[PDB]
Amino acid sequence: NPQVYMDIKIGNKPAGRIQMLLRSDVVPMTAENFRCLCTHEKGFGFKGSSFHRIIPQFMCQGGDFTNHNGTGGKSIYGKKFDDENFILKHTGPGLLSMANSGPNTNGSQFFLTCDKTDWLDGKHVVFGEVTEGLDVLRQIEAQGSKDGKPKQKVIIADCGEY
């Protein structure tokens, strides 16, 4: 299963690195998309993009590296891609799940959960989990607002795969 990382910067200040395991065994197309967006091996990806929507005790959303507001992003597949399956459930904090705009609209946007969010089960594809740096995810969450607006910008300063 791929392991990938993101170094996070908050306002001016390096916060640390989040390492993530991607569940290619469960959701191969989804895991591969996110992997390539971490390495930029297809010519584009997450580096320098932001977590543009952060809601405390809920989730930190990013991956909109085109419009930086929730309206953009793109998958490696040239088009949005289907929900692969909903086997993995939103059982606690520290999980990777795809943002979308309805069935079969996966692109590059994703969120890291900050609690168990089981009301999203069957609506969003979960595809990975944080293996180190849960505390950096907490620092991201610390910039959140009820309405999602970040108090300071949170940037993926660097990212890649191990």
Phi then psi dihedrals of residue 139, to 5 deg: -70, -35
Q: Which of 34, 110, 111, 127 is catalytic?
A: 111
Q: Which of 100, 138, 139, 152 is catalytic?
A: 100
Question: Which segments of the chain are extended strands (E)?
Answer: 3-10, 13-22, 51-55, 59-62, 95-98, 110-113, 126-132, 154-161
Active site residue 124: yes
54 near 145, Cβ under 8 Å?
yes
Residues near 27 by beta carbon (within 8 Å), at least 6 away in sequence? 84, 85, 87, 88, 125, 126, 127
Token pair listed for 162: 């191990």
Cα torsion 43, 47, 53, 55: sign: positive
Q: Tell me, in Å, the resolution of the deposited structure.
A: 1.9
Q: Where are the domains of the chain?
A: 1-162
User: Can you name the residues that pair with 154 across neighbouring β-strands?
Assistant: 10
**Cα–Cα separations (whole angstroms), residue 16 to 11, 77, 134, 136, 144:** 13, 30, 10, 6, 18
Active site residue 58: yes
Active site residue 68: no
Q: Which of 33, 61, 109, 143 is catalytic?
A: 61
Which architecture characterizes domain 1-162 according to CATH? Beta Barrel (2.40)
What method did the depositors use to determine the structure? X-ray
d(CA 103, CA 116): 22
Active site residue 19: no
Identify the CA nearest to 14 among candidates 4, 6, 3, 22. Answer: 6
